[PDB]
Design an enzyme around this catalytic site. Sequence first.
Site, PDB file in Angstrom:
ATOM      1  N   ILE A   1       0.853  -1.196   0.000  1.00 41.16           N
ATOM      2  CA  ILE A   1       0.000   0.000   0.000  1.00 41.16           C
ATOM      3  C   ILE A   1       0.885   1.239   0.000  1.00 41.16           C
ATOM      4  CG2 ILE A   1      -1.538   1.458   1.497  1.00 41.16           C
ATOM      5  CD1 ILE A   1      -3.181  -1.070   1.929  1.00 41.16           C
TER       6      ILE A   1
ATOM      7  N   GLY B   1       6.620   5.191   4.566  1.00 42.81           N
ATOM      8  CA  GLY B   1       7.103   6.473   5.046  1.00 42.81           C
ATOM      9  C   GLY B   1       8.160   6.318   6.117  1.00 42.81           C
TER      10      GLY B   1
ATOM     11  N   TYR C   1       7.583   6.257   9.265  1.00 43.62           N
ATOM     12  CA  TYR C   1       7.005   5.305  10.190  1.00 43.62           C
ATOM     13  C   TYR C   1       7.393   3.838   9.898  1.00 43.62           C
ATOM     14  CZ  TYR C   1       3.612   3.979   6.633  1.00 43.62           C
ATOM     15  OH  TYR C   1       3.035   3.497   5.482  1.00 43.62           O
ATOM     16  N   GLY C   2       7.658   3.484   8.640  1.00 41.93           N
ATOM     17  CA  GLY C   2       7.751   2.082   8.240  1.00 41.93           C
ATOM     18  C   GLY C   2       7.036   1.816   6.938  1.00 41.93           C
ATOM     19  N   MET C   3       6.444   0.627   6.812  1.00 45.15           N
ATOM     20  CA  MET C   3       5.734   0.186   5.608  1.00 45.15           C
ATOM     21  C   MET C   3       4.358  -0.341   5.937  1.00 45.15           C
ATOM     22  SD  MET C   3       7.095  -2.553   2.779  1.00 45.15           S
ATOM     23  CE  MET C   3       8.347  -1.448   2.169  1.00 45.15           C
ATOM     24  N   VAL C   4       3.410  -0.177   5.015  1.00 44.49           N
ATOM     25  CA  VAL C   4       2.051  -0.626   5.198  1.00 44.49           C
ATOM     26  C   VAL C   4       1.592  -1.458   4.015  1.00 44.49           C
ATOM     27  CG1 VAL C   4       0.957   1.521   4.313  1.00 44.49           C
ATOM     28  CG2 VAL C   4      -0.280   0.068   5.912  1.00 44.49           C
TER      29      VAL C   4
ATOM     30  N   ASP D   1      -1.952  16.826  15.150  1.00 48.07           N
ATOM     31  CA  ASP D   1      -1.564  16.817  13.753  1.00 48.07           C
ATOM     32  C   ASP D   1      -2.695  16.482  12.827  1.00 48.07           C
ATOM     33  OD1 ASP D   1       0.414  17.274  11.823  1.00 48.07           O
ATOM     34  OD2 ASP D   1       1.074  15.186  11.863  1.00 48.07           O
TER      35      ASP D   1
HETATM   36  O1  LIG Z   1       1.331   5.021  12.269  1.00 46.16           O
HETATM   37  C1  LIG Z   1       1.787   6.079  11.854  1.00 46.16           C
HETATM   38  C2  LIG Z   1       1.134   6.839  10.721  1.00 46.16           C
HETATM   39  N1  LIG Z   1       0.362   5.984   9.836  1.00 46.16           N
HETATM   40  C3  LIG Z   1       0.921   5.414   8.612  1.00 46.16           C
HETATM   41  C4  LIG Z   1      -0.282   4.740   8.011  1.00 46.16           C
HETATM   42  C5  LIG Z   1      -0.414   4.015   6.847  1.00 46.16           C
HETATM   43  C6  LIG Z   1      -1.638   3.497   6.487  1.00 46.16           C
HETATM   44  C7  LIG Z   1      -2.768   3.706   7.278  1.00 46.16           C
HETATM   45  C8  LIG Z   1      -4.066   3.108   6.874  1.00 46.16           C
HETATM   46  N2  LIG Z   1      -4.389   3.236   5.572  1.00 46.16           N
HETATM   47  C9  LIG Z   1      -5.542   2.673   5.160  1.00 46.16           C
HETATM   48  N3  LIG Z   1      -5.872   2.811   3.860  1.00 46.16           N
HETATM   49  C10 LIG Z   1      -5.108   3.528   2.857  1.00 46.16           C
HETATM   50  C11 LIG Z   1      -5.292   2.898   1.482  1.00 46.16           C
HETATM   51  C12 LIG Z   1      -4.641   3.752   0.402  1.00 46.16           C
HETATM   52  O2  LIG Z   1      -5.154   5.102   0.413  1.00 46.16           O
HETATM   53  C13 LIG Z   1      -4.854   5.734   1.665  1.00 46.16           C
HETATM   54  C14 LIG Z   1      -5.515   5.003   2.820  1.00 46.16           C
HETATM   55  N4  LIG Z   1      -6.391   1.974   5.946  1.00 46.16           N
HETATM   56  C15 LIG Z   1      -6.052   1.845   7.229  1.00 46.16           C
HETATM   57  C16 LIG Z   1      -4.897   2.401   7.728  1.00 46.16           C
HETATM   58 CL1  LIG Z   1      -4.499   2.202   9.408  1.00 46.16          CL
HETATM   59  C17 LIG Z   1      -2.624   4.430   8.470  1.00 46.16           C
HETATM   60  C18 LIG Z   1      -1.391   4.950   8.815  1.00 46.16           C
HETATM   61  C19 LIG Z   1      -0.975   5.752   9.986  1.00 46.16           C
HETATM   62  O3  LIG Z   1      -1.662   6.155  10.925  1.00 46.16           O
HETATM   63  N5  LIG Z   1       2.873   6.632  12.359  1.00 46.16           N
HETATM   64  C20 LIG Z   1       3.535   6.189  13.584  1.00 46.16           C
HETATM   65  C21 LIG Z   1       2.985   7.022  14.758  1.00 46.16           C
HETATM   66  O4  LIG Z   1       3.093   8.417  14.514  1.00 46.16           O
HETATM   67  C22 LIG Z   1       3.571   4.678  13.910  1.00 46.16           C
HETATM   68  C23 LIG Z   1       4.747   4.533  14.816  1.00 46.16           C
HETATM   69  C24 LIG Z   1       5.725   5.531  14.261  1.00 46.16           C
HETATM   70  C25 LIG Z   1       7.105   5.596  14.344  1.00 46.16           C
HETATM   71  C26 LIG Z   1       7.793   6.639  13.746  1.00 46.16           C
HETATM   72  C27 LIG Z   1       7.100   7.605  13.040  1.00 46.16           C
HETATM   73  C28 LIG Z   1       5.718   7.529  12.939  1.00 46.16           C
HETATM   74  C29 LIG Z   1       5.030   6.500  13.553  1.00 46.16           C
END
Ligand SMILES: O=C(CN1Cc2ccc(-c3nc(NC4CCOCC4)ncc3Cl)cc2C1=O)N[C@@]1(CO)CCc2ccccc21
Length: 342
Positions: free
Chosen positions: A21, A24, A26-29, A139
């Site tokens: 998906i 960043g 943060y890592g990978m999703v 944020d």
């Molecule tokens: O965790 C995040 C930020 N992130 C990254 C992230 C990617 C994905 C989705 C997501 N996405 C979709 N769907 C997507 C389909 C494509 O279109 C966009 C939408 N569904 C469900 C979800 Cl939970 C949510 C998130 C999210 O909250 N940062 C964190 C916390 O600050 C963790 C720990 C960490 C460590 C260092 C620095 C940052 C961070």
Amino acid sequence: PEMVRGQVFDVGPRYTNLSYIGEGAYGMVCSAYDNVNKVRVAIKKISPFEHQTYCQRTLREIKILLRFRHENIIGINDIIRAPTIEQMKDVYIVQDLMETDLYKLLKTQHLSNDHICYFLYQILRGLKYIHSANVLHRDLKPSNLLLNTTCDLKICDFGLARVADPDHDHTGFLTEYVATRWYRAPEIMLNSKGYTKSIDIWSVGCILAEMLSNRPIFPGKHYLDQLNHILGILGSPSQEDLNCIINLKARNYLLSLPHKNKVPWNRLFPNADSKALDLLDKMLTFNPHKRIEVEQALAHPYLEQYYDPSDEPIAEAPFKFDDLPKEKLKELIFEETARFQP
Ligand SMILES: O=C(CN1Cc2ccc(-c3nc(NC4CCOCC4)ncc3Cl)cc2C1=O)N[C@@]1(CO)CCc2ccccc21
């Protein structure tokens, strides 16, 4: 173990068929088929343990989101990690998978007034709950608002979230700040650490303006340019609002600027509903003491179709729990994720 774009994903057995998906700091999703619940989910792999600032974001994300339970706030469904502190190099956070986010939607789609109204209602309903727990998201922005195929909205990313601390809010002029520039309240650049609920309401104001025209309202290219975009629309602060800024560097900066008149909202947003612009005005108030609060916003005539305080839940208790080391934050992460082990 499965690989995705050159990365191990040790999510199995439970989670299979992994599609990439995104990515960043943060890592990978990925999405993944969840074999217990028979649904695809989002899983984000965090590898934070060599940077204490990523460990802080990880602990905040996990602790807050496991406490919170609300239809307009993303949950954590499961957390995967190794069985011991020593073997734990990664944390996988499993959350409901959502079709898109408001950032992506705004770059591609015109929003009807009905869509804008419903999105704004949902943001504020989630924020009521966040604020009722004495927490500040800090944020809020379109990419942190997830959307499904039927436009249900969920607030995500609580890695910058704090307990509110309005007696420690004051600071000097031009104090550095971490949250996303375009959605920073004017007081951040003047005399505020961003420790009050009114910071979040400003960001929501910015999001509302952005839904009205699919363009950020205040796209500053650097720290002080952000205040000057703000003042370009709101105009020069009144005497009363200036007298509230006792810090002399901040006061004298504002007094140095030429007089700017207010740009009327109905000229910036000629097609917008007039009640939406009334609420916008109250959210984008220069003086944070005069800025509307989340519960008043919900009660605003623009959201009359949806407003129902009995169906706008609050947290059962205030949230609580710091320049600690990477190694102790790892311990805390290990403790908080234990409930998901067999
Ligand atoms: O965790 C995040 C930020 N992130 C990254 C992230 C990617 C994905 C989705 C997501 N996405 C979709 N769907 C997507 C389909 C494509 O279109 C966009 C939408 N569904 C469900 C979800 Cl939970 C949510 C998130 C999210 O909250 N940062 C964190 C916390 O600050 C963790 C720990 C960490 C460590 C260092 C620095 C940052 C961070």
